[PDB]
Amino acid sequence: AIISKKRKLVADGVFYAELNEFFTRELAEEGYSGVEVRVTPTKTEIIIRATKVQDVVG
Amino acid sequence: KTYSYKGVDLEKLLEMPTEDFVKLAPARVRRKFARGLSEKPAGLMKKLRAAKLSAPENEKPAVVRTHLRNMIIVPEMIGSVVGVYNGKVFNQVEIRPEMVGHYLGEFSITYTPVRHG
Amino acid sequence: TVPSVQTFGKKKSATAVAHVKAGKGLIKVNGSPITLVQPEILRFKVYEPLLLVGLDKFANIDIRVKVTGGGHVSQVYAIRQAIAKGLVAYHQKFVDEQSKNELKKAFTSYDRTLLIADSRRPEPKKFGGRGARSRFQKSYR
Amino acid sequence: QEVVIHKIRINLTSTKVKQLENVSANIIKNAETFKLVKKGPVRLPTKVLKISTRKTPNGEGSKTWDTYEMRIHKRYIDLEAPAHIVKRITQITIEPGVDVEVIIAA
Amino acid sequence: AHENVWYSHPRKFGKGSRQCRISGSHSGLIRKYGLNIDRQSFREKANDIGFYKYR
Amino acid sequence: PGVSVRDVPAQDFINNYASFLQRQGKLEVPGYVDIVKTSAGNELPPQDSEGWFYKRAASVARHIYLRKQVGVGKLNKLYGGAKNRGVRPHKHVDASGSINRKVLQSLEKLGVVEISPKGGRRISDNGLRDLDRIAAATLEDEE
Amino acid sequence: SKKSHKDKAKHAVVLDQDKFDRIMKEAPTYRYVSVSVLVDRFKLGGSLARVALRHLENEGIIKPVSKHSKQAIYTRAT
Amino acid sequence: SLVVQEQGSFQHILRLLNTNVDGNINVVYALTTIRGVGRRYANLVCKKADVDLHKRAGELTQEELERIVQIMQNPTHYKIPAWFLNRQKDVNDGKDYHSLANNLESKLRDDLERLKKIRSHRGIRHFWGLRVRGQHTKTTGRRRA
RNA sequence: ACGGAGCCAGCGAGUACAACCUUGGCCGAGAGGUCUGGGUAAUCUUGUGAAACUCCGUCGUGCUGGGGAUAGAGCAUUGUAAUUAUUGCUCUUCAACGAGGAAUUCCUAGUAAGCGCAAGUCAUCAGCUUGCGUUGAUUACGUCCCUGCCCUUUGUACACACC
Ligand SMILES: [Mg+2]
Ligand SMILES: [Mg+2]
Ligand SMILES: [Mg+2]
Ligand SMILES: [Mg+2]
Ligand SMILES: [Mg+2]
Ligand SMILES: [Mg+2]
Ligand SMILES: [Mg+2]
Ligand SMILES: [Mg+2]
Ligand SMILES: [Mg+2]
Ligand SMILES: [Mg+2]
Ligand SMILES: [Mg+2]
Ligand SMILES: [Mg+2]
Ligand SMILES: [Mg+2]
Ligand SMILES: [Mg+2]
Structure with a gap:
């Protein structure tokens, strides 16, 4: 949207923190280890590094 | 000199509409009324008038007692007897003609006077 | 084109950019005659390089200095540095090495920061006090 | 027929630097191997974003304070360029972290 | 709990108009750049936010 | 033999141009003058009981001559220093806008200023020449 | 605290013709002249100290050496 | 510059608004001595009275005193706002x-x-x-x- | 001190699912309101034309034009709501105060001190606070005497350790 660049960057950072705390909360039993957020013009992919990959996959 | 408000003598004061008071009554209350008032003081004044008319014309009308403190003393409510809440008890107060302009909370001393020794 | 060089001088924030050309003794800072710097007491300071060397040294030269930033004394010192640096740069570039040599000797021989920039610069204020190296006060009781 | 010069304008953004710098390097290398006219990768004052907080959560202790920050770099660029090659350049060579925006200068 | 009396009071503004979004606290809140989070929650999550101690 | 306003010392130039406006009957003076503080900062009027308006106009015209274009708010910030806020630490408070607006309107009425396209006021040709003449005369009076 | 100064007017608020005679023949024999000195001789209150001193610059009785404000420094015609 | 002060005419002690004032103070600040009169008020009254700002409280004439007091007691008629x-x-x-x-x-x-x-x-x-x-x-x- | 006049900064921040920074043109003495603007940001506020300071005047040793608390009245502004005075502005009132006992704090160069400005809080509110810059020094460039600290040696009935 029409949002200042600094505000948008802070929003992206707090969204990163969003996901990080989310995954720590839920995926812990499945061995969550880290998160990354990569963005293309098309889609915003979230790459989830975990110990037990299949259980996260389900 | 009995009393006059701004050259509006007490006799003239006795029954003036609030809108007439608006042109008098310096900037604070002026801004208040200009910026609407609320629903509640309508009910307060209605209750006051009801107690005024119902009383048998010889005694000070029955205690109209309420928690609404921000209300302000307008001409067509002189003579009523209001219990203005205090945080403990509705402090009783009659409405002298000089009460006008000020607040109802003014006569509800929110704290007992402090004394040492 | 007219032989002309541009220099700068600084004082903690204040920047004086001087452009010197082959002119007729034209000396304007902010488009005003140099005689009218407001400090009025730091006034001699804006003259200060010239009197060291003698204004005859620049009779075929014109100097215009645009200056920004700083306070007032900082502004004046930046103007001084700009003037001196412009003289040195022009004389070195177009006149002769020895000419620049006596100019540098005369400038450095008096108030060394007249030619060289001052590095003396404020440092951040730490917390716990009104100044970078001050503390509020203590009670003890 | 899309021969009209577009005056396309790019603006980058990055919390960090090296990704932004190599992205700009890639954009300029693509433009130059495509024979485009460019106004160079201008450098803008990296806006520092500072927050000073009290370390202690309770206020007890000697007054001690800290200053977190980022330093954002924008560094817009601009081309006098046609569409398809340039729009394809815009949609390629993006790494994470660096955010890119495009305005057509229509 | 009258539908027009329960939670009647406005909250367009003031201290309680906004929450920590991490703990829902009111005290020690930061509103700069829209963080809307409190002192110390910021104190540890800032590194993942992108903040780092420099000076 | 050429000269400009930037070529003349300031303070004496402002007072000279103020006196020239004083002797001339132009520059109509609003009625509410001689009572206003010219700034919320001020608590005593101008010490000059009459004619301070002319000096203010001189300063304003000189200032517009110096800059590209200026509005009333720029003057308001420029004029006026610090309150003695009783016990409060001083801050800056902007001067009175009525004085600056009336000064600008009067200058427009005289014709030394015109409303710039960019938004604000700027100096016209004839007024600029007027200030040039005043500058040359002040320099001559100096020597 | 207590007004123990015991100070009278210690100056002159409105001049005398005799006071004008004093100041007129007084410019000689005082080689240093300043508003401070003129008040110091009990003869000028100080509000009119500058007034009188400027008046002395009517026939060039006392030439200026530095005419800055906050003071006034002059020396007799010699 | 200066005048001969007209000895025999400078007032010393004046009684205005049944309050005593000293004639040696400047007129504005002298009038400030009266209660309910500040420096700004006294200054505006004095300049409305056409009486000079740089005068002393002992040098004004009696008709000027009458003008000043009638100004100070009836401001609204005299374009005091x-x-x-x-x-x-x-x-x-x-x-x-x-x-x-x-x-x-x-x-x-x-x-x-x-x-x-x-x-x-x-x-x-x-x-x-x-x-x-x-x-x-x-x-x-x-x-x- | 008060009038005028001169007219220099640097850190910031700023409206979105809403309503910020506000230029300019209006009007009003003022706070202010008003209509159009620009600005999601080296673009506009902004060159934040800030203060101290600079120059010319007035005042003149007087608790005085120092000092501005405490006090009446008015005009507005944020707010559902300002009374127990939010804040601003206008007038008037002008108090206490004479360089501050024993004590005690901080400080060695862009330093202390003066001077403000931006940001946090914020709807409205700072005397706070972080940072910023400006005007910018006196005096050391040393010693364990007071208050402590390092380590070594020594003595101890101490080990909750000279409280
Ligand atoms: Mg300091
Ligand atoms: Mg000023
Ligand atoms: Mg003061
Ligand atoms: Mg005073
Ligand atoms: Mg001044
Ligand atoms: Mg700057
Ligand atoms: Mg200023
Ligand atoms: Mg006093
Ligand atoms: Mg001070
Ligand atoms: Mg606090
Ligand atoms: Mg040492
Ligand atoms: Mg100690
Ligand atoms: Mg034991
Ligand atoms: Mg013992």
């Missing part, structure tokens, strides 16, 4: 008076006992002789008499 006054409106009669010294104490007092009679918090506090403007008093004042 409806504001600027000591007691604008006067919450009794709605006409903008400007109280002078003795009238000033009389009226301020009568307002104080009106507030006492009104029995407002302002009134009760004024009766108590504490801080009435709602300031902190836990550590302030602590000592008057």
Whole structure:
């Protein structure tokens, strides 16, 4: 949207923190280890590094 | 000199509409009324008038007692007897003609006077 | 084109950019005659390089200095540095090495920061006090 | 027929630097191997974003304070360029972290 | 709990108009750049936010 | 033999141009003058009981001559220093806008200023020449 | 605290013709002249100290050496 | 520059508005000595009176004194604005008076006992002789008499 | 001190699912309101034309034009709601105060001190606080005497350790 660049960057950072705390909360039993957020013009992919990959996959 | 408000003598004061008071009554209350008032003081004044008319014309009308403190003393409510809440008890107060302009909370001393020794 | 060089001088924030050309003794800072710097007491300071060397040294030269930033004394010192640096740069570039040599000797021989920039610069204020190296006060009781 | 010069304008953004710098390097290398006219990768004052907080959560202790920050770099660029090659350049060579925006200068 | 009396009071503004979004606290809140989070929650999550101690 | 306003010392130039406006009957003076503080900062009027308006106009015209274009708010910030806020630490408070607006309107009425396209006021040709003449005369009076 | 100064007017608020005679023949024999000195001789209150001193610059009785404000420094015609 | 001062004409002690003033002070600040008269007010009154700013309180003539006092007691006729006054409106009669010294104490007092009679918090506090403007008093004042 | 006049900064921040920074043109003495603007940001506020300071005047040793608390009245502004005075502005009132006992704090160069400005809080509110810059020094460039600290040696009935 029409949002200042600094505000948008802070929003992206707090969204990163969003996901990080989310995954720590839920995926812990499945061995969550880290998160990354990569963005293309098309889609915003979230790459989830975990110990037990299949259980996260389900 | 009995009393006059701004050259509006007490006799003239006795029954003036609030809108007439608006042109008098310096900037604070002026801004208040200009910026609407609320629903509640309508009910307060209605209750006051009801107690005024119902009383048998010889005694000070029955205690109209309420928690609404921000209300302000307008001409067509002189003579009523209001219990203005205090945080403990509705402090009783009659409405002298000089009460006008000020607040109802003014006569509800929110704290007992402090004394040492 | 007219032989002309541009220099700068600084004082903690204040920047004086001087452009010197082959002119007729034209000396304007902010488009005003140099005689009218407001400090009025730091006034001699804006003259200060010239009197060291003698204004005859620049009779075929014109100097215009645009200056920004700083306070007032900082502004004046930046103007001084700009003037001196412009003289040195022009004389070195177009006149002769020895000419620049006596100019540098005369400038450095008096108030060394007249030619060289001052590095003396404020440092951040730490917390716990009104100044970078001050503390509020203590009670003890 | 899309021969009209577009005056396309790019603006980058990055919390960090090296990704932004190599992205700009890639954009300029693509433009130059495509024979485009460019106004160079201008450098803008990296806006520092500072927050000073009290370390202690309770206020007890000697007054001690800290200053977190980022330093954002924008560094817009601009081309006098046609569409398809340039729009394809815009949609390629993006790494994470660096955010890119495009305005057509229509 | 009258539908027009329960939670009647406005909250367009003031201290309680906004929450920590991490703990829902009111005290020690930061509103700069829209963080809307409190002192110390910021104190540890800032590194993942992108903040780092420099000076 | 050429000269400009930037070529003349300031303070004496402002007072000279103020006196020239004083002797001339132009520059109509609003009625509410001689009572206003010219700034919320001020608590005593101008010490000059009459004619301070002319000096203010001189300063304003000189200032517009110096800059590209200026509005009333720029003057308001420029004029006026610090309150003695009783016990409060001083801050800056902007001067009175009525004085600056009336000064600008009067200058427009005289014709030394015109409303710039960019938004604000700027100096016209004839007024600029007027200030040039005043500058040359002040320099001559100096020597 | 207590007004123990015991100070009278210690100056002159409105001049005398005799006071004008004093100041007129007084410019000689005082080689240093300043508003401070003129008040110091009990003869000028100080509000009119500058007034009188400027008046002395009517026939060039006392030439200026530095005419800055906050003071006034002059020396007799010699 | 200076004048011969016209000995035999400079007033020393004046009695204006049944209050005594000293003639050696500048006229504006001299008039400030009267209660209910400030420096700004006295200055505007003086300049409305055409009497010079740089005069002394002993050098003005008697007709000038009469002009000054009639100005100072009836401002509204003399294009002194409806504001600027000591007691604008006067919450009794709605006409903008400007109280002078003795009238000033009389009226301020009568307002104080009106507030006492009104029995407002302002009134009760004024009766108590504490801080009435709602300031902190836990550590302030602590000592008057 | 008060009038005028001169007219220099640097850190910031700023409206979105809403309503910020506000230029300019209006009007009003003022706070202010008003209509159009620009600005999601080296673009506009902004060159934040800030203060101290600079120059010319007035005042003149007077608790005085120092000092501005405490006090009446008015005009507005944020707010559902300002009374127990939010804040601003206008007038008037002008108090206490004479360089501050024993004590005690901080400080060695862009330093202390003066001077403000931006940001946090914020709807409205700072005397706070972080940072920023400006005007910018006196005096050391040393010693364990007071208050402590390092380590070594020594003595101890101490080990909750000279409280
Ligand atoms: Mg300091
Ligand atoms: Mg000024
Ligand atoms: Mg002061
Ligand atoms: Mg004073
Ligand atoms: Mg001044
Ligand atoms: Mg700058
Ligand atoms: Mg300023
Ligand atoms: Mg006094
Ligand atoms: Mg000070
Ligand atoms: Mg606090
Ligand atoms: Mg040492
Ligand atoms: Mg100690
Ligand atoms: Mg033991
Ligand atoms: Mg013992």
